[PDB]
Write a protein that holds these residues in place. Structure first.
Motif, short mmCIF file in Angstrom:
data_model
loop_
_atom_site.label_atom_id
_atom_site.label_comp_id
_atom_site.label_asym_id
_atom_site.label_seq_id
_atom_site.Cartn_x
_atom_site.Cartn_y
_atom_site.Cartn_z
N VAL A 146 0.82 -1.23 0.00
CA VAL A 146 0.00 0.00 0.00
C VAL A 146 0.85 1.28 0.00
CG1 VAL A 146 -2.01 -1.14 1.05
CG2 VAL A 146 -0.44 0.18 2.52
N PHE A 149 1.52 1.48 -3.73
CA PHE A 149 0.25 1.88 -4.37
C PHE A 149 -0.20 3.29 -3.96
CE2 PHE A 149 -2.15 -1.83 -6.44
CZ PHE A 149 -0.99 -2.55 -6.70
N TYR A 150 -0.73 3.43 -2.74
CA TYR A 150 -1.45 4.65 -2.32
C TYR A 150 -0.53 5.84 -2.03
N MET A 151 0.34 5.70 -1.03
CA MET A 151 1.28 6.75 -0.64
C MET A 151 2.27 7.07 -1.77
N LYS A 152 2.76 6.02 -2.44
CA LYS A 152 3.66 6.14 -3.59
C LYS A 152 5.01 6.82 -3.26
N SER A 158 6.79 8.77 4.85
CA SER A 158 6.42 7.53 4.16
C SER A 158 7.58 6.57 3.96
CB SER A 158 5.77 7.85 2.81
OG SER A 158 5.44 6.66 2.10
#
Ligand SMILES: CCCc1nc(C(C)(C)O)c(C(=O)O)n1Cc1ccc(-c2ccccc2-c2nnn[nH]2)cc1
Length: 376
Positions: A146, A149-152, A158
């Motif tokens: 994730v 995917f999401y945070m990238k 992060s």
């Protein structure tokens, strides 16, 4: 590889016992001669902080000259074609093997040996280790994917949290080896390599995490009290270096040892001035005091001042992690009083030794529930 040499000898020595002709004898003997010389170069378990030129190591290698000298005269018989005569000479390596285990492979008996041996500890601890394992695998596996995917890898926060997920996975892979260890009533079947790397992997998790959480704190301090993606990545790879180097005592002193001349084999630290307590306390200062003060003084400002979403997870990870290590630091302090000879009573030893596994679960329970804090 010194354990493999003894395995090579003990396996070959059994081929001599079931031999027929001189060729089969010599073929096995010629391989045993090589392993003794390869072993003679090595360093044994109990001689870690001594030089290759020490009288201890001079005696190590002389034992393997007595071995090779015995393998010579047995070969002399096998070259002449004397099987039954050579089969007897090969049994002289059993007294060398016995002599060797006594001198390097037996852990010096404590006054309270059985302290900590309770039946529930060998069912409770492994089933705990099993839950922490498989939940943590699927837990931290979901977190890394994730982040891609999401945070990238958007924020500086992060990337440290991606690293913490990986550092948790490196730990978790090894756990099954300590689960069964404790399930087998403390005995280690997996050999001497894994004794070191699996012990280096849990020290790693302590240093890696705390250095990673220090960075998460320093990040969130800078990010919203005084509002560097490249520098964050440069840090993360440097954190792995320091955590590896801080776990280097696990690679040096950990060995598979027998105890009290028995079959069961334990994967224990060798301590052997009494500076092992003097510099066994420098792990607590650099682990606790250096981060704890920096991390408290980091958040006490920005908590009071305050961005919000990532602060909530990091706070929850940080507070739990340090609260989890209080129970254990209390009992590992107490254990150092027992090891020093300050406190005698074996009933007290028993309490500390049985408490230890449980306090260790708590300290490393964060590796499976850190992912749950991401959910939030
Ligand atoms: C998560 C560790 C699992 C574990 N449980 C146990 C027992 C008490 C049998 O249940 C053991 C064990 O003492 O062999 N282990 C290995 C271990 C423990 C602490 C450490 C450790 C942690 C922090 C700092 C240093 C060490 C360390 N390195 N070497 N020896 N201790 C390393 C390996």
């Amino acid at each position: 590889d010194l354990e493999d040499n003894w395995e090579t000898l003990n396996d070959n020595l059994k081929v001599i016992e079931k031999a027929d002709n001189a060729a089969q004898v010599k073929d096995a003997l010629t391989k045993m001669r090589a392993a003794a010389l390869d072993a003679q170069k090595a360093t044994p378990p109990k001689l870690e902080d001594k030089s290759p030129d020490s009288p201890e190591m001079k005696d190590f290698r002389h034992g393997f000259d007595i071995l090779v000298g015995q393998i010579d005269d047995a070969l002399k018989l096998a070259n002449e074609g004397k099987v039954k005569e050579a089969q007897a000479a090969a049994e002289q390596l059993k007294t060398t093997r016995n002599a060797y285990i006594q001198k390097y492979l037996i852990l010096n008996s404590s006054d309270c040996p059985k302290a900590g041996r309770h039946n529930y500890i060998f069912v409770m601890i492994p089933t705990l280790y099993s839950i922490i394992f498989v939940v943590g695998i699927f837990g931290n596996s979901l977190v890394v994917i994730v982040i891609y995917f999401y945070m990238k890898l958007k924020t500086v926060a992060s990337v440290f949290l991606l690293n913490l997920a990986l550092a948790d996975l490196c730990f978790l892979l090894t756990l099954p080896l300590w689960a069964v260890y404790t399930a087998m009533e403390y005995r280690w079947p997996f050999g001497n390599y894994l004794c070191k790397i699996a012990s280096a992997s849990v020290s790693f998790n302590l240093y890696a995490s705390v250095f990673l959480l220090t960075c998460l704190s320093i990040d969130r301090y800078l990010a919203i009290v005084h509002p560097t993606m490249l520098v964050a990545k440069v840090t993360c790879i440097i954190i792995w270096l320091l955590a590896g180097l801080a776990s280097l005592p696990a690679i040096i002193h950990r060995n598979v040892f027998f105890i009290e001349n028995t079959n069961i084999t334990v994967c224990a630290f060798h301590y052997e001035s009494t500076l092992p307590i003097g510099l066994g306390l420098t792990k607590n200062i650099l682990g606790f005091l250096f981060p704890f003060l920096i991390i408290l003084t980091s958040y006490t400002l920005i908590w009071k001042a305050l961005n919000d979403d990532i602060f909530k997870i990091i706070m929850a990870i940080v507070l739990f992690f340090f609260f989890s290590w209080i129970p254990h630091q209390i009992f590992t302090f107490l254990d150092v009083l027992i090891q020093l000879g300050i406190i005698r009573d074996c009933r007290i030893a028993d309490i500390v030794d049985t408490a230890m596994p449980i306090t260790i679960c708590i300290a490393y329970f964060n590796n499976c529930l850190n992912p749950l804090f991401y959910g939030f």
